[PDB]
A paper describes a structure:
The NIMA-related kinases (Neks) are a family of Ser/Thr protein kinases, first discovered in Aspergillus nidulans that are conserved in eukaryotes. Nek7 is 1 of 11 Neks found in humans, and contributes to the assembly of a robust mitotic spindle apparatus. Human Nek7 is a 34.5 kDa protein, comprising a singular canonical kinase domain made up of a small, 5 β-stranded, N-terminal lobe linked to a larger, mostly α-helical C-terminal lobe.
We also determined the structure of Nek2 bound to the same inhibitor, to enable a direct comparison of binding modes. The overall binding mode of compound 51 was similar in both structures: the purine scaffold lines up along the kinase hinge region; the substituted phenyl group sits on a Gly residue in the post-hinge region (G92 in Nek2, G117 in Nek7SRS), and the sulphonamide substituent points towards solvent; the cyclohexyl group fits between an Asp residue in the post-hinge region (D93 in Nek2, D118 in Nek7SRS) and the Gly-rich loop. The orientation of the substituted phenyl group of compound 51 is clearly different between the two structures: when bound to Nek2, the phenyl ring lies flat against Gly92, and the sulphonamide-amine substituent points towards Asp93; when bound to Nek7SRS or Nek7WT the phenyl ring is rotated so that the sulphonamide-amine points towards the N-lobe where it interacts with the side chain of Arg50. The equivalent residue to Leu113 of Nek7 in Nek2 is Tyr88, which partly fills the space occupied by the phenyl-sulfonamide of compound 51 in the Nek7-bound pose. A striking feature of the Nek2.51 structure is the contrast between the highly ordered core of the kinase and the poorly ordered C-helix. The C-helix in the Nek2-ADP structure has B-factors similar to the rest of the kinase core, whereas the C-helix in the Nek2.51 structure has the highest B-factors of any region modelled in the structure. Instead, it appears that it is unable to compensate for the loss of the stabilising effect of ADP on the C-helix.
Numbering used by the authors: 4 to 16, 21 to 130, 142 to 160, 178 to 189, 194 to 279
Write the structure that this text describes.
């Protein structure tokens, strides 16, 4: 079945951009080497991939297929290609070009990732968030821990904290809590103090990101409360 696809190139490490021969459809696959995975593990692997095969949602990276080649003892997980790359590169680009992201773009990310989470909760970091060709935002996969919530370090509201951190970093081009060591990082996170996002961003956007970064999980907004915010409009949602 791997022969049904042509590898175009390796995106990163392997994650490869591929083309399906039957119709030219562009995809990616992740090549997993199960050559050392014991018989006991391979069950934990199969169930994991089958639950990854559960989420059909426009803001979640879509799973298409799984391929085994016992030749190289290699499993290929085939999924949607996201042409716009990851948010980390967008943050990098902004930093290097000394240019803050548009509030409209930040609102799109907030809206569509909240909907992804809403779906995940029913059934998080910049390198795991992808853009497609039409501004749409996609959650994938669904060493200093910049986004670790205070309760996790001492819960659906923990995801809200993490979304708060990501949106903050999209606005400020830096995370809300920074430190040279983990113990210092933990100190800062527990104190819950951070600079306002840049002043080009509205008080309203600052307020919701700040609410997501409340020290108390029960004071952070739910996904439903986030989506009720008057900032969030139809054009911020996914569009085919
Ligand atoms: C931190 N950043 C600098 C990352 C490195 C820089 N490349 S990049 O910015 O992601 C980039 C550029 C152009 C297209 C795409 N499209 C894409 N990439 C995936 O995974 C990449 C993989 C992530 C983990 C480690 C290895 C790489 C996809 N997975 C499912 N659909 C995918 N679509 C990505």
């Amino acid at each position: 079945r791997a022969e049904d696809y042509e590898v175009l190139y390796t995106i990163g490490t392997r994650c490869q951009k591929i083309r399906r021969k039957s119709d030219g459809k562009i995809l990616v696959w992740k090549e997993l080497d199960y050559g050392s995975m014991t018989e006991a593990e391979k069950q934990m692997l199969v169930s994991e991939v089958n639950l990854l095969r559960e989420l059909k949602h426009p803001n979640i990276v879509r799973y298409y297929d799984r391929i085994i080649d016992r030749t190289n003892t290699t499993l290929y997980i085939v999924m949607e290609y996201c042409e716009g790359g990851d948010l980390a590169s967008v943050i990098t680009k902004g930093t290097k070009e000394r240019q803050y992201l548009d509030e409209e773009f930040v609102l799109r990310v907030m809206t569509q990732l909240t909907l992804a989470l809403k779906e995940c909760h029913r059934r998080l970091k910049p390198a795991n968030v992808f853009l497609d060709g039409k501004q749409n935002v996609k959650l994938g996969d669904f060493g200093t821990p910049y986004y670790m919530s205070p309760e996790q370090m001492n819960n659906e509201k923990s995801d809200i904290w993490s979304l708060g951190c990501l949106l903050y970093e999209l606005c400020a081009l830096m995370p809300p809590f920074t430190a040279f060591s983990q113990k210092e990082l933990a100190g800062k996170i527990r104190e819950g103090k951070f600079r306002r996002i840049p002043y080009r961003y509205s008080d309203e956007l600052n307020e919701i990101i700040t609410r997501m970064l409340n020290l108390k999980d029960y004071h952070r907004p739910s996904v439903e409360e986030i989506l009720e915010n008057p900032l969030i409009l139809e054009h911020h949602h996914h569009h085919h």
